Write a protein that binds this DNA or RNA. Structure first.
Ligand SMILES: [Zn+2]
Ligand SMILES: [Zn+2]
Ligand SMILES: [Zn+2]
Lengths: 159, 559, 263, 133, 102, 65, 84, 43, 114, 196, 141
RNA sequence: AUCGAGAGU
DNA sequence: ACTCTCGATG
């Protein structure tokens, strides 16, 4: 691998360094070895990173991976977008999938989870439990055909 | 899913689209018969009536008329039937469904709608012939081209709704995009191969054209700028007139590889105050680029200036070109005889490389590269050996093609094509690949029934040696087929896998928004970000500057 | 005489290859364009169909007759149907023809333009005759019949011009070239090795001089001399095609000038 | 109203850089041995060649639309053959005791270098360039 | 008023790098009048660049990744779309695991 | 489907030259390239119109009524 | 709850969305023969009236900005600053 | 009409790939695009 | 279908005058003539001869869009000259050449055999 | 359009004069753009054109049979014997002005196809119309003056923009929009419009 | 008379097929540089030779002029579009009463042909005309 | 109402 | 397992 690191003088230059690339994962026991630098060691399995180094390091890898998906094709996307996605995944404490198990079990009003894969059930177990839908959600005021708390409808108008 | 969050809807239209260069960026040539059909409810008022009545009088079939009038009681008067249809004195506090007219606001979308940008308010300009017409440089955000693409158009009914379209949604406001903090529209095809030839040093334009060109630009200040050349025959440079289109307070500095404030490659770019100083203009300057003349002009002068910029650049370059002309013959893929000899042997020596590794491996001498099969290492060596052959034979062709070779001329603009496209057209086309590896053995230990079993040589394992010019051989052709079948396949599967991503991505985030405290939170009030982006800064208003504190000598930090 | 000048070289019943010396290109062009697009002619702008048992369809047949070449020498004393004061046509602004042919024989009966049949009172003016340059004597092949098929038609030729529809074109091809050698350098020839072994040499290089390699220094080079050839279709002979071109051009220039007088 | 600079130079290199109608010329000044020149030149309109001796001026002289002629009866600083007009853009200290200026004649660039050209080659829009014989 | 200090941090590190005393004076010779303009100008130009409350970034961020995703199509890694498919699912079952040790 | 009256691009009459063209090939025994030059077709837009026009009409005349 | 004329953080500048709909809701009223509190140098279109009503701060509306707990602040279109 | 008579259809590892043995029997190029691609073949 | 009839290229509608003249606001002694139901055949020829007369500063034309049969000439002339004359002289200058030609062709037409 | 996957719609119609023209008087029937020739490497298209030119001239069939000894050269050597330049370039004149074109242009007969999909068969446009029995939404397809689907996905985009009122207007006043009565206790569509 | 065999996939497996019979089995013994680069004789075993190679193609692609000098997915596009081409579908169109049928007015056999057009009866029932095309930038429409 | 061929990136 | 147009059946 190649690296850009300060000269004793100030100039940033190419100290070329030696890195080992692996086929398989056990974080728990490699960073505890001699000679490796535990402060750096990286896995593309962000899932592992979490369970070892805690969530806030896991966020960062989850981003750093999504990034390499995009950047590998040429495409730039400004941080904040990916940052948000990543940050939404990583705020219920754990890693929360972008499929029906992570974000569609997550204590929202019922109607917003209706508007997505498992529709009918979600209405039933909403029924029996007697959920109370807030009606602060985009997807719910759209069903009711009213002004959405959005750009134009986030404030109120008066006299 | 289908009736409540995505309905079918009234006041909508749809048509084939085709490009029209003499039409401003934010405009949409709505064909007439559609504008004869769609209707905006306008309320009678002292400010309008005089116009307004003339429409009800015109009647629903001569363009600038209308259909239906409606009254206090809420009874619908039908303008096409009814005895009293050439009559009717318009009474304040009524309404008048009317033909969509020039300069109305409309939402004009293309499916699929994977953006804000796939939906943008335009400015109507009614026309004959039955095509939604548009400006070329609103192509990208929609991702249209004109080989059939069909496009929708919705019309706002409410006065507030009109505002929402003209104020938040419209095409000039979307120019600089938050998605990649860069502009999403540039200058494409004809226009762009032109924005360049026009600007070579060499390019000289004399009086009579100059005066038309000048005039062609609408915002022209009417001041024949003084010709660079005055001596024998007083010429202007390309640059020179294009400088007219460029407004004032516009400053741009580039610098590519060989760039020197003399620029003996006419390299980089230098622009001071709506004037181009040196350097060819091509995609780096005027593409959908970051430093981009369009990123600049939008932020500096204003959106609406940049909108009218596009048109002007276009109209001048589109013209000059129309009188200069441009083409592409098979001649433009042909290359120098002695190079087709040099290409040939450049392949041949790589065919001997492979041979020799193969004969090497055939003797168990080939050393396995730690952690891969001797057979993996053989493959990888070979693959590389002919990827480097194609590319060398290719680079070899990139050089005969002269500054006039029309293919190369587009390549230098960045209008279309690439080095790869030259390679495959003029040189060798290359190694075919299926599931990452060179052609399989479908038949037992052989590729096709025209080969001996156990044959790992190139020819046999999917190397196409000829060009898209000279032509392939049967075998080659059939491998090549398997190439872009895989290609087609995952292409139409790329679209399904992704279609679903962009649905889910949307549905989870969806209700996240920056609230009036500069927090960032969903419907529950659960905070997600404490400052949007961590700096509370809209992505649009942002750009690649340098931090000169970070780099260089402790001495030169201090020098 | 004065400025603009001609030298005919080849001349036929349909060809006029001339030299046009001492003029702006501007006009050498605007002449050519007019010559194509603006000189008026007679052709069929209304077919009235009684019976057609033929293979072909009604409006297919119609189309073809439209294109049929018709005499147009005394056109400029016929009127445009939109201008006359008569409901629809009148023998003062139209010329009516008839087509009757009926499959009689066993052996495939042909219908030529030769079979078109003046009806309307011409007024004794040369107008609306199917033009026949054919040697065997039959113009165009309009359509074919079998044993028992009819065509029963009624054409109505009106005055018109290319701009409206190209059937009113009186001219096919308009050969046009200037500065045979690229003395003026209006083009930039495309080449592999020798720009001059790789293109060829028009017959038009004979009636001009070479460049003599070394002879550059002055400047300001305009275009006199244009090498044309008008191929007439027959509606008008060739002479008139160039002339009326020149006339009609002159006529619409007039109409602007006289429209300042009128303002 | 006046003239800004003057010198006779001699041309060394004549450079066609993938270009037919323009050559850039590195030429040097007979007289002062602390001075040289760089000029992008229409060699179709005014030919030039090896070891040549050319005459130069700058000026600001003999701004509304450009009228032409009616000047076969008029003032002209046109004793000179070849004549351009450019904006100017950089005044580079080579450091010293020595200084260079940069002009653009619609992209046909110029470099010039000396040090009396101080109170004499302003910082300005104006700049004709007149090259004779 | 701590958050305020934090968001700004980096912007200033630029600001102080550009508007520093050798530089203002020697590099790009300003004058008071122009300088105080540059100053008042930046402030506004900053202020303009703030996010507007209402901005539905939820979607915007999804779309802004949901698009260039559909534009990917063709050194032993799971890359492009399938990787994106892997990542968002929160894949336990992943195909190209790899450690990268220094 | 019958010979086209007048060539598309150029304009010159050509439907008058069909029966004559077929009689130059089949009868005085000539190659299409000469026939095309004899009949007065010297451009190739005007040419391609004859070398191609395919006469399906001969084959709908075949049907009875 | 409520909130005072003081103790207001909430951008003293105008959002594009606030404006957007203020220009909408006004454009609406003008377009229904309700009075115009400007002088028209010569305009008819209800929106471009309201653009002028606004850019001489004579529009008599009040934004009510909601915070995410259950509270809010009032802002007259005299107070808010039209930068943009 | 000729093409549609000479058509093949397959219901449902990797059958969409042009496969080696197709040489000479099935048409390499002729196939619909997208959501039935390579499942439908022409002889 | 949305297609406009072909005659809408050389036939003037209702209240549509061959020449509609407006005085260019940006310059001085300058003029922009709209020409209706005409095209490049005309505007090009006018423009070429509108530049031969040595008391003219500027002249140019443009067909704002090809769908329509209009075109816009712009003339600016020297202190004194009123462009309406510049145009008049122009137009006449043309007509004389076309006559001149019309004769000269007819002359040399007559001398040849057939 | 052509024969090598180079589909294209008409953008405009120009009359013969306004077309560019060759010195022989010829005008093209169709002008394609050169920019669609590098990226899809549709070389044959170019070859066909060269061959087809030669063939129409010499009055013979163009043999473009695939695996042959026919050559771009072999053709080019013939095309010259007939007096044109060997890669199908011809000097053309911009017909607007009569002036020569600075570039020489690729010119030749090329077999083109007409495809189904014409415009007048597509140009559906509704402005309120029939509505489905069950839903009370507009109906599918242009065969019966139907609506256009403002699908789930187009909504996302209106939300992105921040255009709330427009979202209501599109999702209600066009399409489904109805009024119901509701109990202010047992909050249900139980109620009973004795409305009068 | 045993001059030709019927071979399926499975038997194909156990053979050797020559491409062109000419250049692929006369004795081994200059190269016009613009000819493509075919491989060699390297094979001695040849049990039956391919009739001619173009017969790997189906109905549609057989229509293409020069598909060898052409990117492989482009050919595939033309082959889904030759089936939307307008032409004469049958001589008797006049007498068949069918929902929707389009026929061209002046059908034109192509100028650039395939040897296997003969058996596809494409010159006898064309679809497409023979246009003069000009590759150029003009109005930019 | 239920199924079957094609459009576009 | 986006929007589209067509063509068919109990
Ligand atoms: Zn009459
Ligand atoms: Zn012709
Ligand atoms: Zn109740």
């Amino acid at each position: 691998y190649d690296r850009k690191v300060p000269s004793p003088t100030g100039e940033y230059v190419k100290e070329p360094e030696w890195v080992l690339e692996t086929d398989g994962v056990n974080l728990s026991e490699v960073m505890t070895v001699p000679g490796i630098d535990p402060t750096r060691i990286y896995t593309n399995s962000f899932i592992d990173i979490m369970e070892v180094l805690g969530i806030e390091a896991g966020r960062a890898a989850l981003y750093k991976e999504v990034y390499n998906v995009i950047a590998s094709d040429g495409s730039y996307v400004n941080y904040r977008h990916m940052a948000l996605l990543v940050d939404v995944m990583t705020t219920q404490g754990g890693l929360t999938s972008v499929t029906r198990h992570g974000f569609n079990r997550s204590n929202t009003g019922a109607l917003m989870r209706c508007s997505f894969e498992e529709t009918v059930e979600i209405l039933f177990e909403a029924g029996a439990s007697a959920e109370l839908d807030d009606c602060r959600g985009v997807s719910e005021n759209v069903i009711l055909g009213q002004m959405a708390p959005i750009g134009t409808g986030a404030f109120d108008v008066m006299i | 899913r289908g009736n409540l969050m995505g309905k079918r809807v009234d006041f909508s239209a749809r048509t084939v689209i085709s490009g029209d260069p003499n039409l401003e960026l934010d405009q949409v040539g709505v064909p007439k018969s559609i504008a004869k059909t769609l209707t905006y409810p306008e309320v009678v008022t002292p400010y309008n009536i005089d116009r307004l009545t003339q429409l009800v009088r015109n009647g629903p079939n001569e363009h600038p008329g209308a259909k239906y009038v409606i009254r206090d009681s809420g009874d619908r008067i039908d303008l096409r039937y009814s005895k009293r249809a050439g009559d009717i004195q318009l009474q304040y506090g009524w309404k008048v469904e009317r033909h969509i007219m020039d300069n109305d606001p409309v939402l004009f979308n293309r499916q699929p709608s994977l953006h804000k940008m796939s939906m943008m308010a335009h400015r109507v300009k009614v026309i004959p012939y039955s095509t939604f017409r548009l400006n070329l440089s609103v192509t990208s955000p929609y991702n249209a081209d004109f080989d059939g693409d069909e496009m929708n158009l919705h019309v706002p009914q409410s006065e507030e709704t009109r505002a929402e379209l003209s104020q938040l949604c419209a095409v000039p406001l979307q120019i600089v995009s938050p998605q990649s903090n860069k502009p999403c529209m540039g200058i494409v095809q004809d226009t762009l191969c032109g924005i360049r030839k026009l600007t070579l040093r060499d390019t000289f334009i004399e009086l009579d054209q100059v005066l038309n060109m000048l005039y062609w630009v609408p915002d022209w200040d009417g001041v024949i700028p003084t010709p660079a050349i005055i001596k024998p025959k007083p010429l202007w440079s390309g640059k020179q007139i294009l400088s007219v289109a460029i407004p004032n307070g516009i400053h741009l500095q580039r610098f590519d590889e060989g760039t020197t404030l003399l620029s003996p490659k006419d390299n980089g770019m230098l622009i001071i105050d709506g004037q181009i100083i040196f350097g060819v203009v091509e995609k780096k300057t005027v593409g959908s680029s970051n430093g981009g003349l369009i990123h600049v002009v939008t932020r500096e002068k204003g959106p609406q200036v940049c909108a009218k910029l596009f048109g002007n650049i276009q109209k001048v370059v589109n013209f000059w070109l129309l009188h200069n002309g441009f083409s592409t013959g098979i001649g433009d893929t042909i290359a120098d005889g002695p190079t087709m000899r040099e290409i040939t042997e450049t392949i041949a020596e790589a065919k001997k490389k492979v041979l020799d590794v193969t004969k090497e491996a055939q003797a168990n001498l080939l050393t396995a590269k730690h952690g891969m099969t001797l057979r993996e290492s053989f493959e990888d060596n070979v693959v590389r050996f002919l990827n480097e052959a194609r590319d060398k034979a290719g680079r070899l062709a990139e050089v005969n093609l002269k500054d006039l070779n029309n293919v190369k001329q587009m390549v230098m603009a960045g209008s279309k094509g690439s080095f790869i496209n030259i390679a495959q057209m003029s040189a060798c086309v290359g190694q075919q690949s299926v599931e990452g590896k060179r052609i399989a053995f479908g038949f037992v230990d052989r590729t096709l029934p025209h080969f001996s079993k156990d044959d790992y040589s190139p020819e046999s394992k999917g190397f196409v040696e000829n060009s898209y010019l000279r032509g392939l051989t049967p075998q080659e052709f059939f491998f090549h087929a398997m190439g872009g079948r895989e290609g087609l396949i995952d292409t139409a599967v790329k679209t399904a896998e992704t279609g679903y991503i962009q649905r889910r991505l949307v549905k989870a985030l969806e209700d996240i928004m920056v609230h009036y405290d500069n927090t960032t939170r969903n419907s529950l009030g659960n905070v997600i970000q404490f400052i949007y982006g961590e700096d509370g800064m809209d992505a649009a208003h942002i750009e690649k500057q340098s931090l000169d504190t970070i780099g260089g000598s402790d001495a030169a930090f201090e020098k | 005489e004065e400025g603009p000048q001609v030298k005919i070289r080849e001349a036929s019943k349909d060809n006029v290859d001339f030299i046009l010396s001492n003029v702006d290109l501007a006009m050498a062009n605007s002449l050519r364009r007019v010559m194509i697009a603006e000189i008026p002619t007679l052709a069929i702008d209304s077919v009235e169909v009684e019976t057609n048992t033929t293979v072909l369809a009604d409006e297919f047949i119609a189309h073809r007759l439209g294109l049929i070449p018709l005499q147009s020498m005394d056109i400029e004393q016929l009127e445009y149907s939109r201008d006359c004061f008569c409901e629809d046509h009148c023998d003062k602004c139209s010329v009516v023809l008839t087509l009757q042919a009926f499959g009689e024989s066993e052996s495939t009966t042909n219908v030529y333009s030769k079979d078109l049949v003046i009806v309307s009172n011409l007024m004794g003016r040369n107008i609306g005759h199917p033009i026949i340059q054919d040697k065997e004597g039959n113009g165009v092949l309009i359509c074919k019949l079998r044993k028992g098929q009819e065509l029963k038609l009624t054409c109505v030729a009106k005055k018109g011009i290319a701009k409206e529809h190209a059937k009113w074109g009186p001219a096919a091809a308009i050969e046009f070239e200037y500065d045979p050698w690229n003395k003026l350098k209006h083009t930039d020839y495309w080449y592999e090795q020798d720009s001059a072994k790789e293109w060829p040499q028009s017959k038009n290089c004979e009636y001009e001089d070479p460049p003599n390699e070394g002879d550059p220094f002055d400047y300001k080079a305009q275009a006199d001399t244009f090498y044309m050839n008008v191929e007439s279709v027959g509606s008008i002979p060739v002479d008139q095609v160039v002339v009326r071109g020149i006339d009609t051009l002159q006529k619409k220039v007039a109409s602007i000038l006289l429209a300042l007088t009128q303002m | 109203s006046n003239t800004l600079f003057d010198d006779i130079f001699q041309v060394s290199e004549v450079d066609p850089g993938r270009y037919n109608k323009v050559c850039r010329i590195e030429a040097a000044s007979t007289t002062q041995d602390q001075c040289k020149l760089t000029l992008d030149i229409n060699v179709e309109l005014f030919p030039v060649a090896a070891q040549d001796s050319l005459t130069v001026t700058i000026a600001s002289s003999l701004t509304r639309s450009w009228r032409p002629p009616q000047a076969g009866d008029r003032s002209l600083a046109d004793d000179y053959d070849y004549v351009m007009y450019g904006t100017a853009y950089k005044f580079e200290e080579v450091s010293k005791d020595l200084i260079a200026v940069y002009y653009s004649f619609g992209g046909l660039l110029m470099r010039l270098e000396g040090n009396y050209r101080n109170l004499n080659n302003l910082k300005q829009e104006n700049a004709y360039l007149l090259i004779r014989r | 008023q701590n958050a305020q200090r934090d968001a700004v941090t980096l912007f200033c590190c630029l600001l102080r790098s550009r508007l520093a005393t050798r530089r203002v004076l020697q590099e790009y010779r300003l004058t008071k009048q122009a300088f105080d303009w540059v100053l008042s100008n930046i402030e506004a130009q900053f202020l303009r660049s703030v996010v507007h409350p209402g901005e539905m970034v939820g979607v915007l961020a999804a779309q802004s990744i949901g698009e260039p995703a559909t534009q990917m199509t063709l050194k032993k890694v799971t890359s492009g779309v399938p990787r994106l498919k892997e990542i968002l699912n929160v894949a336990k079952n992943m195909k190209t695991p790899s450690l990268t040790v220094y | 489907m019958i010979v086209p009256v007048r060539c598309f691009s150029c304009g010159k009459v050509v439907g008058d030259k069909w029966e004559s063209y077929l009689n130059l090939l089949q009868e005085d025994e000539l190659d299409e390239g000469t026939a095309l030059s004899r009949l007065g077709l010297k451009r190739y837009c005007c040419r391609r119109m004859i070398l191609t026009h395919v006469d399906l009409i001969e084959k709908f005349l075949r049907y009875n009524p | 709850k409520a909130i005072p004329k003081d103790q207001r953080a909430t951008t003293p500048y105008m959002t594009k969305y606030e404006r957007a709909r203020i220009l909408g809701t006004r454009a609406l009223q003008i377009s229904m023969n309700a009075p115009v509190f400007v002088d028209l140098e010569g305009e008819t279109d209800p929106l471009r009236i309201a653009m002028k009503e606004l850019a001489e701060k004579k529009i008599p509306l009040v934004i009510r900005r909601y915070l995410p707990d259950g509270s809010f602040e009032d802002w007259s279109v005299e107070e808010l600053i039209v930068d943009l | 009409t000729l093409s549609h008579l000479r058509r093949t259809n397959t219901p449902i590892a990797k059958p969409r790939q042009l496969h080696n043995t197709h040489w000479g029997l099935v048409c390499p190029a002729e196939t619909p695009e997208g959501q039935a691609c390579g499942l439908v073949k022409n002889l | 279908m949305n297609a406009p009839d072909r005659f809408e290229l050389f036939l003037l509608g209702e209240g549509e005058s061959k020449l509609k003249i407006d005085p260019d606001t940006k310059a001085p002694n300058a003029v922009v003539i709209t020409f209706e139901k005409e095209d490049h055949t005309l505007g090009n020829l006018i423009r070429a001869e509108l530049l031969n007369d040595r008391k003219v500063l500027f002249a140019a034309y443009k067909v704002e869009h090809p769908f329509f049969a209009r075109f816009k000439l712009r003339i600016q002339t020297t202190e004194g000259y009123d462009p309406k004359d510049a145009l008049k002289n122009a137009c006449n200058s043309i007509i004389n050449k076309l006559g001149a030609l019309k004769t000269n062709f007819e002359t040399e037409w007559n001398l040849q055999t057939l | 359009a052509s024969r090598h996957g180079q589909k294209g719609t008409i953008g405009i119609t120009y009359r013969r004069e306004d077309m560019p023209f060759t010195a022989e008087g010829i005008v093209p029937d169709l002008i394609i753009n050169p920019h669609a020739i590098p990226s899809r490497m549709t070389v044959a298209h170019l070859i066909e054109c060269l061959l087809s030119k030669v063939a129409a001239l010499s009055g013979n069939e163009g043999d473009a049979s695939p695996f042959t000894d026919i050559t771009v050269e072999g053709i080019s050597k013939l095309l010259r014997e007939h007096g044109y330049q060997s890669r199908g370039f011809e000097v053309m004149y911009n017909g607007h002005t009569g002036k020569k074109l600075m570039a020489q242009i690729f010119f030749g007969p090329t077999y083109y196809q007409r495809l189904r999909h014409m415009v007048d068969d597509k140009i559906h446009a509704r402005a309120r119309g029939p509505m489905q029995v069950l839903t009370r939404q507009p109906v599918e397809g242009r065969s019966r003056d139907g609506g256009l689907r403002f699908g789930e996905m187009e909504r996302d985009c209106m939300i992105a923009h921040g255009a709330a009122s427009f979202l209501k207007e599109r999702l209600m006043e066009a399409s489904d929009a109805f009024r119901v009565h509701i109990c202010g206790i047992c909050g249900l569509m139980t109620v009973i419009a004795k409305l009068n | 008379e045993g001059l030709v065999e019927y071979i399926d996939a499975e038997e194909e497996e156990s053979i050797l097929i020559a491409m062109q019979p000419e250049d692929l089995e006369p004795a081994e013994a200059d190269v016009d540089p613009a000819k493509r680069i075919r491989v060699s004789h390297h094979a001695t075993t040849f049990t039956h030779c391919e009739i001619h190679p173009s017969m790997i193609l189906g109905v549609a692609a057989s229509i293409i002029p020069f598909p060898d000098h052409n990117q492989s997915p482009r050919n595939t596009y033309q082959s889904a579009m030759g089936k939307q081409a307008m032409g004469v579908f049958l001589t008797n169109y006049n007498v068949r009463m069918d929902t929707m049928a389009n026929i061209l007015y002046y059908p034109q056999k192509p100028l650039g042909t395939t040897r296997a057009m003969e058996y596809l009866k494409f010159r006898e029932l064309p679809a497409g005309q023979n246009a003069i095309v000009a590759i150029a930038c003009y109005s930019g429409y």
